[PDB]
Amino acid sequence: PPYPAW
Amino acid sequence: QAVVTQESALTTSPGETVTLTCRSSTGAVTTSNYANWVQEKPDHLFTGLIGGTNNRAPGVPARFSGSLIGDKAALTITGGQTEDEAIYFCALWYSNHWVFGGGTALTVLGQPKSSPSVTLFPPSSEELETNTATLVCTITDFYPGVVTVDWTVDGTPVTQGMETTQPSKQSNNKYMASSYLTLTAAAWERHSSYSCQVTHEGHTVEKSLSR
Amino acid sequence: QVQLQQPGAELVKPGASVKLSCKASGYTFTSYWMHWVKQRPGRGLEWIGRIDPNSGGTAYNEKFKSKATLTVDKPSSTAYMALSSLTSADSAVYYCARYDYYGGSYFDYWGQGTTLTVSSGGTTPPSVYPLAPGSSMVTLGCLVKGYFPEPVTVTWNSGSLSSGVHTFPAVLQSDLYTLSSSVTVPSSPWPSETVTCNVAHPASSTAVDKAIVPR
């Protein structure tokens, strides 16, 4: 479940 | 950190609904695993179909949909098409990296199943003059596309010095494969019998010869 | 039509680096992320990392954190992945895949991948052998044995043979390659008129013509 700026 | 595991192979018929699943080992596959499904076709043809568990990629036929069946993610092909015969991968996101599954070979019978045409070739005199001998088993026109090859020397199951090609799809839509038994020139001279057995769905086809 | 082109093969030596290219086209290069996957048969797929054209900001799979380096070139619109201290364990097929994240979210488009073969092995010409039958349709073959590297071309009767023809993928036997081809023909033309197997191996610049006869 995520990690950046998307 | 997570081994994603998919069904080995599945077989459906044109017009039916088939379901491929995807087990995560950390626990139940959720909506934050953003399960992705990928279709693989001959000649490295990789296409994305569903992303974020149930989001169909633009252009993907409507008969494809992704979802969650219990504690897993699943791919459902409604009215499976002859062209859907491909291998399908699963992809689960885990907090900063994707992990893929083994992949499921899908067969939608697109034609009647045929047993393979086996042919065994003894080594050529040409080769034996180099102190080594190779037995060649060409396996063609079998569908669906999976077979197991079993070799023997003097009725005994052999062992070692053997190599089998992965199935390969032909133009008429069936599959082909070949297998090899490598011997020292003398080993081929020690033994008398040689047979290539090919199992295709519980059904065996064999070709034997004698030096 | 969205496409991503990558070299089909690259031969490199253990302990060196390679820079794999993945040319994109058919859209705006900076609006989609680019991911790289590693494939070795028996080992499924392995996600290496991801890059975004704009920031150049990466997210690496921790196992490839110091092995791979993702990079891009805006004007040419191509993504790059550099593998550094190459060894036999880096021989695999490397794919680039596009992923959308703002208006959808998924992997969509994939290039065909570059099969990387990391070895020091010298060129090795294949030894070609005629495959004559085992005694209404007879099967003949041609054994292309122990050549390196890939890849070796096989045709029959100079192109005169179309169907019945089957060139199998290559298998690896002792760090050297081996494949073969088959041709099934009515039992009316063989031996009668003969079939000619034509093998070529670029690396050793070698072509071997072979007529199959009944010994």
Side-chain angles (χ1 to χ4, degrees):
Chain A
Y3 56 135
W6 54 351
Chain B
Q1 232 40 37
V3 310
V4 175
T5 129
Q6 302 177 59
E7 300 94 320
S8 172
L10 296 171
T11 299
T12 182
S13 289
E16 306 201 45
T17 292
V18 73
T19 317
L20 289 64
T21 56
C22 184
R23 270 259 166 193
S24 150
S25 64
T26 54
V29 182
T30 71
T31 245
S32 54
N33 275 166
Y34 302 82
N36 256 69
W37 290 86
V38 182
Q39 179 187 66
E40 201 206 303
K41 287 221 220 308
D43 325 302
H44 297 298
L45 233 283
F46 285 86
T47 294
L49 304 145
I50 308 298
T53 290
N54 56 6
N55 307 295
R56 183 176 308 154
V60 161
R63 60 168 182 288
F64 290 100
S65 72
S67 64
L68 291 178
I69 308 301
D71 55 24
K72 317 183 291 181
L75 170 67
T76 310
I77 291 71
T78 266
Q81 307 254 49
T82 219
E83 55 275 8
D84 304 323
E85 172 157 344
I87 305 167
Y88 302 75
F89 280 107
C90 181
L92 266 42
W93 174 251
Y94 286 87
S95 300
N96 59 354
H97 71 288
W98 307 83
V99 178
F100 286 73
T104 294
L106 181 64
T107 297
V108 189
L109 296 156
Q111 70 172 296
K113 309 156 124 201
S114 50
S115 309
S117 294
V118 172
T119 313
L120 182 49
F121 286 103
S124 62
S125 41
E126 239 125 315
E127 170 167 36
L128 281 93
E129 295 181 296
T130 61
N131 201 351
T132 183
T134 306
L135 280 281
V136 177
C137 194
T138 64
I139 313 165
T140 68
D141 299 302
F142 61 97
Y143 179 90
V146 300
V147 294
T148 301
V149 189
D150 287 284
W151 292 89
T152 73
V153 181
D154 292 309
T156 304
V158 86
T159 191
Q160 81 151 120
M162 196 255 264
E163 300 263 31
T164 297
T165 72
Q166 313 266 283
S168 195
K169 212 245 259 292
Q170 318 173 325
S171 71
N172 64 11
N173 282 158
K174 315 211 216 191
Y175 296 68
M176 59 187 206
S178 48
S179 179
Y180 307 102
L181 190 63
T182 312
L183 294 152
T184 54
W188 148 270
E189 278 298 320
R190 283 187 196 103
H191 304 91
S192 131
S193 196
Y194 300 84
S195 65
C196 176
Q197 266 108 288
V198 181
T199 306
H200 170 55
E201 303 195 293
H203 288 82
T204 264
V205 181
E206 161 174 32
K207 281 301 166 64
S208 295
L209 62 72
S210 323
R211 179 191 52 63
Chain C
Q1 43 134 185
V2 192
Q3 229 264 75
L4 305 178
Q5 89 168 62
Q6 308 176 69
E10 285 188 51
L11 208 177
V12 185
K13 264 113 298 85
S17 83
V18 288
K19 220 196 152 191
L20 304 181
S21 69
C22 168
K23 231 286 228 57
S25 61
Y27 69 102
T28 299
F29 176 41
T30 56
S31 308
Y32 293 88
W33 286 358
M34 195 68 67
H35 308 242
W36 296 77
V37 178
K38 173 184 182 169
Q39 176 195 25
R40 296 154 81 190
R43 312 219 175 202
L45 291 162
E46 205 164 51
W47 184 77
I48 296 167
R50 162 221 110 180
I51 183 166
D52 146 55
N54 271 29
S55 309
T58 49
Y60 292 99
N61 185 308
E62 274 220 4
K63 287 181 195 184
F64 297 92
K65 79 185 194 73
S66 57
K67 160 66 61 179
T69 313
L70 306 189
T71 221
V72 304
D73 187 65
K74 276 177 162 67
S76 82
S77 273
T78 91
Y80 293 95
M81 167 168 85
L83 293 171
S84 59
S85 290
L86 267 26
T87 70
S88 49
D90 290 307
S91 291
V93 181
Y94 293 96
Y95 306 97
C96 50
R98 184 238 240 176
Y99 184 95
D100 48 48
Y101 57 99
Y102 222 39
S105 245
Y106 29 13
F107 278 118
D108 64 275
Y109 292 88
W110 292 56
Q112 292 179 303
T114 309
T115 56
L116 182 69
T117 288
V118 172
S119 169
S120 55
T123 297
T124 303
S127 291
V128 178
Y129 301 109
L131 301 194
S135 165
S136 298
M137 283 275 346
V138 73
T139 304
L140 314 166
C142 211
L143 176 67
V144 181
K145 184 166 121 74
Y147 64 102
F148 179 97
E150 202 115 86
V152 314
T153 293
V154 184
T155 58
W156 291 84
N157 267 1
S158 341
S160 289
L161 251 332
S162 139
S163 202
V165 171
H166 301 301
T167 289
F168 309 101
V171 286
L172 199 55
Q173 183 72 42
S174 313
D175 316 9
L176 256 50
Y177 287 101
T178 295
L179 73 76
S180 64
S181 189
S182 183
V183 76
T184 305
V185 300
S187 192
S188 310
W190 196 88
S192 304
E193 37 228 277
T194 275
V195 183
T196 309
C197 157
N198 318 294
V199 188
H201 184 222
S204 64
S205 0
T206 305
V208 191
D209 299 354
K210 232 138 203 312
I212 307 169
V213 290
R215 178 205 145 266

